[PDB]
Write a protein that binds this DNA or RNA. Structure first.
Lengths: 49, 81, 54, 144, 77, 101
RNA sequence: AAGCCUCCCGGUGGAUGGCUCGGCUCGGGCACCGAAGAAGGGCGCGGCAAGCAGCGAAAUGCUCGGGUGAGGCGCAAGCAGCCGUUGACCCCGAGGUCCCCUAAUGGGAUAUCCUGCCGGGUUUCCGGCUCCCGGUUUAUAACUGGGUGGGAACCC
RNA sequence: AGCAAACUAAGUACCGUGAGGGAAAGCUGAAAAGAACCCCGGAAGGGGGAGUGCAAAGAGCCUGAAACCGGGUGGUUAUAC
RNA sequence: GGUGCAGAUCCCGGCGGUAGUAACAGCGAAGGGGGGUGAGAAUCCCCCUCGCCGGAAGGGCAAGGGUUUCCCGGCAACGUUCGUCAGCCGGGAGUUAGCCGGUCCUAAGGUAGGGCCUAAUAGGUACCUACCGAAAGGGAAAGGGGUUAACAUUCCCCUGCCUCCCGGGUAGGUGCGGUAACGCAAGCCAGACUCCUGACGGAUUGGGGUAGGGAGAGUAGGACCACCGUCCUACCCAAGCACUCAAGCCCUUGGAGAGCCGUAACGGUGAGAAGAGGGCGAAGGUGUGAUGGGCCUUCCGUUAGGAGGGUUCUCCUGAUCCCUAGUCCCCAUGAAAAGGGAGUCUGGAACGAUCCCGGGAGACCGUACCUAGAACCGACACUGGUGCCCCGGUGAGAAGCCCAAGGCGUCUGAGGGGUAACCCAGGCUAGGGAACUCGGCAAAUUAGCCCCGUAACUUCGGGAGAAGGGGUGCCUAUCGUGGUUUAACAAAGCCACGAUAGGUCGCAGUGACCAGAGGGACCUGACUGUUUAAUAAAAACAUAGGUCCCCGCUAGCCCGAAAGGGUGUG
């Protein structure tokens, strides 16, 4: 799989990561239930190129 | 320049079996000197260097020492083992 | 056929890729042009006076 | 209770299909504790993991039917032929084998002085003209 | 990444006592060296994909030996 | 590993001199393939002989070296004699040897 | 029994009422930024850190003055640790560092990534490299010193 | 309603090959004192008994309407709108 | 004053009735018994067995996706039902290159800066200069055996090769053999010019290989044993290095005809045939690589391991894969460059390699996984589309049917039923045989191969598989023709095809499967081709043939606002 190093070499908001809230933040904020409002799925959602 | 030393379960097996170290370095992409950065910081000799870029924003090097030196002593000095 | 069978041929390389200047996926690859900021044959930012209602 | 890891690791160590790997029902607590490829190699040796061999099709019926077809002509006859005559023996291959045998036979006779150049040249043209139907036909002509 | 004629398939088992089968891809054969108007490559001249560094092994030992035989030549001396 | 190996010895007999050449095989059907022509193969064996020891122009330019006679095997030892034109004679003797550890 | 009407109790639901660190309109001030690299974007930085905000490999903040006086480690309350009475945090003034793309500018990028040639010390690294103008030097070689893009509306 | 945006990220999520289009969503209490402990349950801000508070529509938390559904009160019902 | 709602196919929010109803069938698959885990099993796990695919439902890899990959732990939501399971949820991890690809070159094509134009540019562009344009075109050099839970021409072991740079020698500077074609360790560094690989269509055929697939003998292991003794599995080796080569083309001699030589076929020859000698020369093969492995197997301890045995021989068949030559065809003549090698000259120094030996170096970026009846696009875990490359019997066959290797019973809802009516697919029907109907629609009939036989008409090629008639199984023996084996012919062993004689059973011998109903007459378009993606495939469009018009190139016809441009490298 041939990635021209703008997506695989720079890693972050360009082909990296989709993660839940860290567990210690959920305890600290005492939140009733704490979600990531930007969660997506590889199969249903779409990632820009 | 060196950033961290990787001590996962794959990294531990390579120290004991292949005499290699696994480090995370800056990805400055004009590389001649990871060889002489470790040869200066730890006073060892390097035989081979194989480098990699992980999918989560890191550059990982597999530096293999010469038979006269043990990668266990370098790891033990850092406290990995 | 116009509908479902022809949407299957929409899995090649896209017509528009990322643009360095604006960070939007609007760079027309085949023409050397960003269809959002003009990067490629405009030094000025592409901007029109109809671009919002008055 | 899932151990698809052990079935997967055993099939490539043994080089067989993943459906050829069977466990020992009486020693499953021992298979369940295997985690590495070194563990699995030992179980195959200790017969805790059985490796089935691949099979083949028995050839007893085929050998007997082929022998009858060869020697008594049974099953070769014109109620068994589905394809065309030229798809069973091509006509060009019939001619290639016929004219090569004739040529290399009279070439031997000329090279060994049984016949002269004029009879060799006369027979060479007749063969090309389909004058003979066999190599037995030329040697009956040779003895006049 | 499927088939391409610019590569020939080989499979090996005759000179062979081990037990497996695979496929090797090599590039098609070369030819005696090229441009063209006079159009005759030569006799005794060598062309290989790599070079054995040879010098007189890849050329005859006449006056114009590697250039061409005595055909397109004497109007050059 | 490999078991059994077939070792061929040819005693080249041209005028005055005498050359002995060795050659191994692996499957006993190659022995007859080597000897099927025995003119190309023996001449190409003499080249390797000259390159190793020294000196060239021994008995090379001989005309067609007439293949061989008939192979006869008495004690599992194959033997044959082959000649060519004149002043060149060869005696061939093939030995089977089990390797064993 | 299927049921039917009325009220009570409960469920489901989220109207009504009250609230508000958000808007909306007027008055009054104030008013250019950029090759000393802008505005805009992309990737990074927290002990455990996903987002916003802040910051840039010196990266949840470094130095010097002034104010303040006992807590501080943002939204955000956990586990663990530390900073501060040798005056911290915070506020104001002045400095330092300031990744890549970007007018983007040594060359190239349908690669936010690659790759040169001179000069300097010398691991790193730091400077110079279209259209014009006034000069140097042999004359098309080379060299010294000096517009481009952004801005809600208003303007020519 | 007020700017499209009073809130865990508004031109944010999400839709389009693209120019472009474009949401939803406020409220425990003065103070978390956010329900120890015991029985049931695989578990569940789940059930029961307790306890905190001026007061538990107690986390799906101010007030809590109607439609709709379930239980009950009072009339009445299988020869007839 | 943003001031009173029952209506606007009103806007938004919540909720009924239909109704616990349709659907969870159709596209050619299927489960059963025993045991386990768990609070809870038609649905998860283990064993036995049964069924289905087997030119795809198996194997390998793209564009696209973007972590879906691997391990551990879960089940509030998610999956057409359930779920203890998962492409879901929580926590940890995983992608290694001088030799693979990008990177480089140019193609059709494009852009920037100058010029010319434009009121102006973010507009046009024939010219000049530069650059861009292919992860299936060109493009220096690697293989095997092993190793992880997850990577491997990338890591380990063994054996190598390329480019450049050092050090030590040597061939050369100042050397040889052959009539010749040619044979070879042949100097160095700086230029100039030239040549040849790179580097190219379609059709058809021979020759040589290789993968693969078979038969027999033997040694180990397995399966069956009512009686026979047969059946299955293993038996095998890379790149590099040394040697060898058929076709073809060359070199000496030789001197042929009213003829010779030769092919599968065309053919060759005094401008020099046959015959004799030779030179250059594929794919492969044989040695070495390798007392190295990996394959089968026995015994002991059954922890850690340890100790043995075998891995041989004779043949056949065979590519749509590979290399090598012919021949034929075009109002088709079937890419360009970087990068390679060589030759001939000019200048310079006397030290010096294109050959052996030792040493050093070879940036940077991609690499996990799917690649599709659940990982891509179609709002979905969508029967569509996007894929390309590959794969024993019967048989002409990659067809239909049956079965290996490999995979599956998740094209993910089930159970009961003497199984109602009815519907979607299928089988058969006495007597009649189109009486049905707009119409023989649908269904039926025929069907493979060999031999015989074949009309009118005709553009003389066709019609034509016209029409029509006969044969076909099994068993017991034979014969003929040809291939192959160190193999003229004849013998021997294997193998293929075509026939012959006799015996025999059934309703039926292309016994299933596969598999044309035929004939006479008229209209219409000559023919092969194209068309309304999603109600029209046609007599419509095109076509070859015919015929007419404009124009001598600063033309004719057409595009532009201009500079200019297409036809026109005509």
């Amino acid at each position: 799989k041939h990635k021209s190093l703008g997506k695989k070499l720079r890693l972050g908001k360009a082909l990296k990561r989709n993660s839940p809230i860290p567990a210690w933040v959920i305890i600290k904020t005492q939140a009733e239930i704490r979600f990531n409002p930007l969660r997506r799925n590889w199969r249903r959602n779409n990632l820009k190129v | 320049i060196i950033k961290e030393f990787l001590a996962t379960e794959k990294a531990v097996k390579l120290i004991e079996s292949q005499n290699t170290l696994t480090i995370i370095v800056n990805r400055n992409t004009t590389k001649k000197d990871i060889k002489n950065e470790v040869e200066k910081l730890f006073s060892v000799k390097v035989e081979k260097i194989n480098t990699l870029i992980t999918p989560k924003g890191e550059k990982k090097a597999y530096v293999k020492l010469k038979q006269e030196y043990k990668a266990s002593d370098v790891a033990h000095k850092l406290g990995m083992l | 056929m116009k509908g479902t069978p022809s949407f299957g041929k929409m899995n090649k390389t896209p017509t528009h890729v990322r643009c360095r200047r604006c960070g939007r996926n609007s760079f027309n690859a085949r023409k050397g042009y960003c269809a959002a900021c003009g990067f490629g044959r405009s030094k000025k930012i592409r901007r029109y006076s109809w671009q919002n209602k008055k | 209770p899932e151990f698809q890891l052990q079935r997967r690791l055993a099939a490539d160590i043994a080089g067989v299909g993943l459906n050829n790997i069977k466990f020992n029902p009486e020693r499953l607590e021992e298979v369940e504790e295997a985690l590495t490829r070194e563990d699995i190699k030992k179980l195959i040796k200790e017969r805790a993991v059985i490796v089935n061999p691949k099979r083949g099709i028995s050839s007893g019926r085929l050998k007997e039917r082929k022998h009858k077809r060869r020697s008594k002509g049974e099953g070769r006859k014109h109620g068994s032929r589905k394809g065309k005559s030229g798809a069973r023996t091509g006509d060009k291959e019939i001619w290639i084998n016929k004219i090569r045998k004739i040529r290399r036979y009279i070439r031997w006779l000329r090279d060994n002085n049984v016949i002269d150049k004029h009879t060799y040249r006369l027979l060479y043209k007749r063969a090309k003209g389909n004058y003979f139907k066999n190599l037995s036909d030329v040697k009956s002509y040779l003895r006049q | 990444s499927p088939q391409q004629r610019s590569g020939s398939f080989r499979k090996v088992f005759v000179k062979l006592p081990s037990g497996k089968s695979t496929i090797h891809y090599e590039r098609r054969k070369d030819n005696i060296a090229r441009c063209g108007m006079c159009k005759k490559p030569l006799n005794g001249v060598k062309n290989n994909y790599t070079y054995k560094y040879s010098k007189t092994e890849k050329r005859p030992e006449r006056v114009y030996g590697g250039y061409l035989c005595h055909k397109c030549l004497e109007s050059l001396i | 590993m490999k078991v059994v190996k077939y070792v061929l010895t040819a005693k080249i007999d041209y005028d005055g001199k005498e050359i002995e050449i060795k050659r191994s095989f692996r499957h006993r059907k190659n022995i007859f393939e080597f000897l099927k022509n025995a003119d190309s193969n023996l001449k190409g064996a003499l080249s390797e002989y000259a390159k190793q020891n020294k000196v060239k122009s021994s008995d090379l330019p001989l005309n067609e070296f007439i293949t061989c006679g008939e192979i006869e095997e008495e004690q599992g030892v194959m033997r044959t004699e082959c000649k060519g034109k004149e002043k060149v004679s060869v005696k061939i003797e093939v030995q089977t040897q089990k390797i064993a550890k």
